[PDB]
Design a binder for this molecule. Structure first.
Ligand SMILES: CCCCCCCCCCCCCCCCCC(=O)O[C@@H](COC(=O)CCCCCCCCCCCCCCC)COP(=O)(O)OCC[N+](C)(C)C
Ligand SMILES: CCCCCCCCCCCCCCCCCCCC(=O)O[C@H](COC(=O)CCCCCCCCCCCCCC)COP(=O)(O)OCCN
Lengths: 46, 487, 76, 51, 93, 67, 72, 615
């Protein structure tokens, strides 16, 4: 039974670290614009 | 010009000739029985070559009048579905004669007579097109298998196995017979072609379908009544244990594919979810039950139940994939279960244990049998390249065309099937030997090493190139699935 | 293996080391070569290779199908 | 070979130590040469003539 | 006897068949069923032919496969929409 | 060639074979038999029937009665 | 390698059948011929029968009719 | 020529296993090595004819299942991704066969080992060259079976039997996942062939009814394929079989538990690149699980004291980074890591096996001490392997192990920063244990017994040439392959990979990344090396052996027992199912209630009803 709590606790560390990544908001701090490609961003190629 | 009637008559001639000769000349009896079985097998193969797979109508038909009005008569005939069952039942009988070849002096001429009568009767079941007379031959196998189980069976519980086997095929059989009579009185004839093209009442198909399923849910090991197979199969002789799981379990499925799916199409749709639940719970429950077994026979008898239940999932999923995979897995099981039960029989006929814990670590002593057993339990796993995989995956594909829940449980069946199959393999062939009760024991002699060679070649031929088998049936399966489905 | 010398051991016993294995090895190589010749013949018979090579490869010495699939309309 | 007070070890083979030493030397040389050529490229000291 | 060749079958739809009362005429039922299944298999083989065509496309197409085989993709998918006895989409023939 | 078949095995083998004499409808085991005999079949039956119903809902066809 | 070895004959007996004395046949079993001839006939009839039979089916017929019909 | 590569191992194993008596204990081994060596030679020929001479060859033998548009065939797919995997698998198999002639020379069952590995090599060649799912599934289940067989090589080992059975359990869970994925492909595209799904995988955008809710097909299929590959790729779902599967022979743990089957799922997901690409939801869980495993294995592998077990966790960490590199839509970097790893990790296991063979199988780092000059060649071999494992700068390890983290930072999402953090952190633990292996063994005052020291017996010629070849590989293969697989737009993946224009962080990564991050893995590796030196050679009185009472020794048990997950999973699933397989069914079903009110339990009233009608 003691070993069970480690699995929940260990996964709790990861979701807790996963929650930290959510709070950090890495997505919106890009130093670059979205990529631009010729021919309407390759519309005929897609 | 080889017709269907000669195939039926060959076992009859072999049995009648065998009764003429006395019992003192035992060599003549066994020789003539094996010769008759083998020539019947060759005749069955010849019938395969001259089989038109393009047309949808039935092949060779022989009509022998039964009632004075020609109302109902013996209407023999094969199609894409019935041909392979005929080939399999002609192939299994010589194996049955060959396994007990050493003990023929102990059994006698009744043994071969019973087996040839079984071959005749089982051939007559699969290749006939009269619904009523098919019922007559359908439970006509009661007498010969009752004799086989009872006369040469267990020590003292042989009586109870015969009674349970005989009792389970009475109430459902006659409750089916009532529906047979209602169909006969309503339409007028029991000819299959006539009965297919009939407008049944919407409320009537429910009762008739239930009555048919009641007598097929006992032959196919469904959830309510499947406990007969383990007990009546352990308490059975090895040659009687190789056709009980090789042919009899096909009667229910074949009967579903002949007189249940076509005649009652919308009843099949209305009863589809119920069959799915029954088959899924059967698969799961049997899988969990079989992994804590110590009887050397039931351990694979439950595997047979699981495979037969998985068959119905795609058999009742109206689809070309589902039904084709159904018959392919049916033939694959008819081979693999037969091979497994022959392996159990040879293991039992040396040591006479009927347990699992006694055997252990015999790979250093019987390497040939070890390899053969590994290949058979490997086919039971449903490896691609083996017989079971193509059919069983086709069943999964066909059911997933219709439904997305139940056959996922069917696939979950194999997440434990393979596990306990290899675990069972590792009980016996692995570990250190225990020469405290295994003093002397030998390996397969020339007979039982050659007996598996047809099994090996048929298994690999199923696995690597099943196109020839699918070629002859795609017309019949497609005709079956589209019947009464105008749009 | 006191008793293990009595079993057939299809792939070889505990420590077989037969008296003449080198000749069996040589005949085994000869048989493998003889049986893989038809495999090579079949492989050279069926190989599409839709695109022509940029440089001459050790192929097209026994394979004659090169650039035979740039006609993807008459396909069955 | 020889024993100290009860433990004796076979002399390492000549064809093993020599190859080990030489191959270690040649991989060290390759590492140092790669450092000389493209060392500034991966450390940002200088770009591979692309700007 | 045999024609020792392809099994020629009548392309003409059988006569005497009425969708409102199919079960009235039993003798015409089986050939209509055979004709329907044969036509379904014709559609299946047409879909397989389109699949083979796109099969041979993808090898020659290269990186930019979308550009010059997009027209055949729709042709293959519309065939797969009315396929035989498949998923919940049952064709109405 | 027949095994020794020591006495301390057949008793347990028959106990596994003859377990039919040990059943007295105990309440905990009665709930255990009832749940796996009825509820799980009912739950799975609802699963398949609702899977069919949701499949038919998207296509827009009316639901089959499925008695 | 360079040494030839030992164990003049591989251990064990094939099929557990003891080898007969030199100059005598194997004394074929009473079912040996009837079943070997059965196997031989089955192998040959499957080899020459399943291949010399016409390739008539619904796959090839549908193939031909799909090729002929797709052109219009 | 091209059919030969896959059938030489199969035919050689078949003849060497059916007639192993004829060829003996050495002829079978040498002939299997010969067959696999020529298979590798034709693999190199195919690589030249396909990779450099870019023209994929396609050949079809005969339909396998000719049913209603389920035309699975025996056709073969030879693209750039196939050949680069072949030149790895067959080359490593041939060198392992050479290594095993001398390693498996004192053992009795020599031919059976050779035939097992040769049929396995045939199965994996069928996997790699397979044109459709069913053939790929065939090879995949075959390689799973053969892995089980090799774990079960010594049948008499009770522990090995259980380990093989558990490996079969997890592999069968993977079989469930991958079979469901494969069939789900057919219900959507009405095909299983690679060239049809890839050609038309973008058109459908419908949602299915998959048994609980409405889910998008492509996302569901990708998730199902991941659930299939978790067992094979050893991901977070089920990867407890690697450390427990080291009970088998070293060469198979050297050959296969480190090179290709562990990356078989990686190769499978890379092969179906234009199917995972259209489901951005899937790539999230791919990256999440990759980071999860790369952290789990690195953390669990730091306190292990077993020679053959500690490196399995390193292999699991490598699998984690490979999965992460797959989830970034940069599978070219993932396969680059694959080819780099297949050299040095196999080199590390082969050197460890050479050491363990000479020291009479004493795989406990508590024992071996300083006898490096006794084994200089193997020391150099494993030094090269471990330095490539570290990602030593300007070696075959640096060209992938740093680039993967660099690409990890350059993508900006929620899970991206998480995965980058885990990948950066795992470097410390990985370097720590990979250097503790070299410290506690051959670099500390000796603790091994005199009976093992006196044996000596340096590795002979047979198991030293493959070591030399792998050493010369994992020193220049990375440099010779960095330009020609990932050259910022090379023409090496015309049809093997589909690179999405949007998820294409390759050009912007090399230039917009800061210089500081491009060197921080080196600093982490040096810090790990210094920590290992401190705890293993200078400060080991308290940093190595702590006599703590509570809250600190439980930490020692936590990492050593692998977070106790090998016990929780057993007791909570396997034990539960083992108990409830009989407890409910065999007691309250089958014989029982269906019997007491059935045939003869209490419905046999006639016996009690017999003596009432004769009144
Ligand atoms: C659906 C099947 C698909 C194909 C699967 C093929 C996979 C191979 C299947 C057989 C694997 C071998 C397992 C045999 C049982 C293992 C234990 C055993 O009994 O081994 C035997 C035989 O050993 C063998 O493994 C030989 C069997 C052949 C193995 C090689 C198989 C090659 C052919 C199959 C693959 C061909 C290519 C694919 C075909 C299309 C004896 O071993 P010994 O070394 O002699 O030990 C001696 C015993 N004692 C110590 C007590 C004295
Ligand atoms: C220990 C010694 C064993 C020796 C065995 C032979 C040695 C080889 C061992 C390898 C195993 C071979 C097993 C057979 C594999 C056949 C694979 C190819 C079959 C195939 O697809 O081609 C078919 C050939 O039919 C045929 O002719 C196949 C004939 C095979 C006969 C096998 C007899 C098995 C009998 C078992 C009965 C079980 C009954 C169960 C229902 C027709 O192909 P197609 O469609 O293109 O037509 C052609 C029209 N031009």
């Amino acid at each position: 039974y003691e070993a069970l709590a480690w699995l929940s606790g260990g996964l709790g560390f990861f979701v807790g670290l996963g929650l930290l990544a959510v709070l950090n908001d890495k997505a919106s701090k890009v130093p670059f614009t979205p990529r631009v490609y010729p021919y309407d961003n390759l519309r005929v190629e897609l | 010009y080889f017709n269907l009637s000669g195939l039926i008559l060959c076992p009859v001639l072999g049995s009648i000739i065998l009764l003429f000769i006395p019992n003192s000349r035992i060599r003549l009896i066994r020789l003539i029985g094996l010769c008759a079985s083998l020539i019947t097998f060759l005749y069955s193969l010849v019938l395969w070559i001259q089989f038109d797979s393009s047309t949808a109508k039935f092949q060779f038909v022989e009509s022998l009048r039964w009632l004075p009005y020609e109302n109902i008569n013996f209407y023999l005939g094969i199609d894409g579905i019935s041909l392979f069952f005929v080939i399999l039942t002609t192939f299994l009988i010589p194996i049955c004669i060959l396994v007990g070849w050493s003990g023929m002096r102990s059994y006698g001429k009744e043994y071969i007579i019973a087996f040839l009568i079984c071959e005749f009767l089982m051939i007559a079941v699969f290749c006939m097109l009269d619904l009523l007379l098919f019922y007559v031959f359908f439970e006509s196998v009661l007498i010969p298998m009752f004799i086989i189980i009872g006369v040469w069976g267990s020590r003292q519980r042989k009586i109870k196995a015969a009674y349970q086997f005989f009792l389970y095929t009475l109430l459902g059989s006659l409750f089916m017979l009532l529906a047979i009579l209602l169909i006969l009185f309503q339409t007028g004839t029991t000819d299959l072609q006539i009965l297919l093209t009939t407008e049944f009442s919407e409320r009537r198909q429910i009762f008739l379908w239930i009555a048919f399923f009641a007598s097929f849910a006992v032959k196919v090991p469904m959830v309510p009544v499947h406990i007969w197979l383990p007990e009546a199969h352990v308490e059975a002789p090895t040659a009687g244990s190789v056709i009980l799981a090789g042919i009899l379990l096909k009667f229910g499925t074949y009967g579903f594919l002949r007189f249940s799916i076509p005649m009652f199409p919308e009843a099949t749709l209305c009863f589809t979810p119920f069959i799915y639940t029954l088959s899924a719970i059967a698969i799961i429950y049997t899988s969990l039950t079989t992994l804590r077994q110590i009887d050397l026979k039931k351990i694979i008898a439950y595997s047979s139940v699981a495979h037969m239940n998985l068959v119905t999932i795609g058999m009742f999923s109206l689809n070309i994939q589902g039904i084709g995979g159904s018959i392919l897995l049916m033939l694959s099981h008819g081979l693999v279960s037969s091979a497994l039960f022959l392996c159990v029989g040879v293991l039992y006929d040396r040591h006479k244990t009927r347990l699992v814990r006694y055997y252990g670590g015999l790979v250093s002593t019987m390497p040939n049998f070890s390899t053969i057993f590994f290949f058979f339990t490997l086919a039971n796993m449903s490896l691609p390249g083996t017989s079971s995989f193509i059919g069983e995956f086709l069943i999964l594909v066909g059911a997933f065309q219709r439904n997305s829940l139940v056959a996922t449980l069917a696939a979950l069946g194999m997440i434990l099937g393979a596990a306990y199959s290899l675990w069972l393999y590792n009980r016996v062939v692995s570990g250190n030997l225990k020469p405290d009760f295994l003093h002397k024991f030998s390996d397969l002699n020339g007979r039982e090493v050659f007996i598996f060679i047809p099994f090996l070649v048929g298994l690999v031929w199923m696995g690597v190139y099943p196109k020839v088998f699918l070629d002859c049936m795609h017309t019949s399966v497609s005709n079956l699935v589209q019947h009464g489905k105008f749009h | 293996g006191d008793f293990r010398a009595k079993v057939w051991s299809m792939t070889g016993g505990p420590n077989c080391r037969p008296k003449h294995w080198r000749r069996n090895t040589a005949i085994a190589m000869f048989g493998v070569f003889l049986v893989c010749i038809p495999i090579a013949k079949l492989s050279a018979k069926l190989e599409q290779r839709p695109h022509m090579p940029v440089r001459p490869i050790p192929s097209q010495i026994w394979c004659k199908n090169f650039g035979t699939k740039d006609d993807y309309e008459k396909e069955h | 070979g020889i024993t100290y007070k009860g433990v004796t070890v076979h002399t390492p083979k000549t064809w093993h130590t020599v190859t080990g030493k030489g191959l270690c030397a040649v991989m060290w040389f390759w590492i140092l040469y790669r450092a000389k050529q493209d060392g500034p490229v991966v450390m940002g000291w200088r770009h591979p003539w692309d700007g | 006897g045999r024609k020792k060749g392809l099994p020629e079958f009548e392309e003409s739809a059988p006569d005497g068949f009425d969708p409102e009362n199919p079960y009235k005429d039993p003798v015409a039922m089986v050939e209509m069923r055979e004709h329907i299944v044969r036509e379904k298999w014709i559609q299946i083989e047409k879909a397989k032919i389109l699949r083979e065509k796109v099969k041979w496309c993808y090898r020659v197409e290269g990186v930019n496969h979308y550009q010059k085989c997009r027209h055949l993709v729709q042709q293959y998918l519309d065939s797969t929409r009315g396929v035989g006895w498949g998923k919940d989409h049952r064709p109405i023939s | 060639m027949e095994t020794n078949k020591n006495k301390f095995i057949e008793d347990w083998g028959s106990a596994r074979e003859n377990l039919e004499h040990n059943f007295r409808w105990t309440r905990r085991n009665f709930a255990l038999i009832g749940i796996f005999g009825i509820a799980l079949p009912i739950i799975v039956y609802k699963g398949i029937v609702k899977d069919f119903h949701m499949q038919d809902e998207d296509a827009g066809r009316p639901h089959r009665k499925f008695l | 390698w360079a040494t030839p070895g030992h164990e003049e004959r591989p251990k064990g007996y094939f099929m557990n059948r003891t080898p007969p004395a030199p100059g005598q046949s194997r004394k074929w079993e009473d079912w040996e011929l009837p079943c070997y001839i059965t196997s031989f006939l089955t192998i040959v009839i499957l080899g020459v029968g399943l291949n010399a039979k016409p390739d008539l089916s619904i796959e090839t017929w549908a193939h031909q009719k799909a090729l002929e019909r797709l052109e219009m | 020529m091209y059919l030969l590569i896959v059938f030489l191992p199969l035919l050689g194993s078949s003849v060497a296993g059916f007639f192993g008596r004829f060829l003996g204990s050495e002829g079978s081994a040498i002939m299997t090595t010969t067959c696999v060596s020529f298979s590798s030679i034709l693999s190199l020929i195919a690589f030249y004819e396909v990779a450099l001479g870019a023209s994929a060859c396609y050949l079809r033998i005969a339909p396998w299942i000719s049913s209603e548009m389920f035309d699975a065939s025996w056709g073969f797919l030879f693209d750039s991704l196939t050949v680069v995997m072949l030149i790895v698998v067959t080359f490593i198999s041939s060198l392992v066969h050479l290594y095993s002639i001398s390693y498996m020379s004192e053992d009795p069952h020599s031919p059976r080992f050779m035939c097992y590995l040769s049929i396995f090599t045939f199965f994996m060649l069928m996997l790699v060259t397979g044109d459709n799912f069913l053939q790929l599934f065939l090879g995949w289940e075959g390689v799973g079976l053969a892995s089980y067989l090799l774990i079960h090589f010594w049948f008499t080992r009770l522990q090995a039997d259980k380990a093989a059975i558990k490996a079969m359990l997890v592999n069968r869970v993977g079989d469930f996942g991958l079979a469901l994925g494969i069939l789900g492909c057919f219900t959507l595209f009405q095909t299983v062939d690679f060239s049809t799904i890839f050609a038309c995988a973008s058109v459908p955008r419908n949602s299915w009814i998959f048994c609980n809710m409405r889910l998008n097909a492509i996302s569901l299929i990708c998730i199902l394929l991941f659930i299939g590959a978790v067992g094979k790729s050893a991901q977070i779902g089920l990867h407890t079989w690697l450390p427990d599967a080291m009970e088998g022979p070293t060469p198979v743990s050297a050959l296969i538990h480190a090179a290709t089957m562990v990356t078989a799922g990686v190769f499978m997901i890379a092969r179906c690149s234009p199917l995972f690409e259209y489901s951005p939801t899937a790539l999230i869980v791919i990256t999440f699980a990759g980071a999860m495993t790369s952290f789990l294995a690195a953390t669990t592998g730091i306190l292990q004291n077993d020679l053959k077990r500690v490196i399995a966790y390193s292999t699991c960490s490598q699998l984690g980074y490979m999965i992460f590199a797959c989830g970034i839509s940069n599978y070219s970097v993932s396969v680059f890591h694959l080819m780099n790893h297949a050299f040095f990790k196999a080199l590390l296991f082969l050197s460890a096996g050479s050491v363990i063979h000479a020291m009479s199988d004493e795989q406990d780092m508590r024992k071996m001490g300083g006898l490096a000059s006794s084994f200089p060649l193997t020391y150099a071999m494993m030094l090269i392997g471990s330095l490539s494992l570290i990602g030593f700068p300007f070696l075959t390890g640096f060209y992938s192990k740093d680039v993967i983290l660099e690409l990890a930072y350059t993508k900006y999402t929620i899970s991206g920063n998480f995965a980058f953090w885990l990948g950066s952190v795992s470097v410390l633990f990985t370097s720590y244990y990979s250097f503790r292996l070299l410290f506690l063994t051959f670099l500390v005052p000796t603790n091994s017994f005199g009976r093992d020291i006196s044996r000596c017996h340096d590795a002979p010629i047979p198991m030293a040439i493959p070591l030399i070849l792998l050493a010369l590989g994992s020193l220049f293969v990375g440099y010779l392959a960095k330009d020609m697989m990932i050259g910022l737009g090379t023409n090496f993946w015309a049809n093997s990979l589909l690179v999405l224009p949007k998820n294409e962080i390759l050009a912007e990564s090399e230039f917009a990344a800061p210089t500081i991050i491009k060197l921080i893995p080196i600093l982490f590796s040096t810090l790990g090396a210094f920590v290992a030196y401190n705890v293993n050679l200078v400060a080991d009185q308290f940093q190595r052996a702590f006599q703590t009472s509570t809250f600190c020794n439980r930490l020692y048990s936590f990492f050593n027992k692998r977070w106790f997950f090998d016990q929780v999973l057993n007791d909570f699933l396997v034990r539960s199912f083992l108990r409830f397989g009989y407890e409910v069914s065999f007691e309250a079903l089958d014989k029982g209630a269906i019997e007491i009110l059935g045939p003869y339990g209490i419905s046999y009233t006639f016996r009690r009803l017999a003596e009432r009608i004769s009144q």
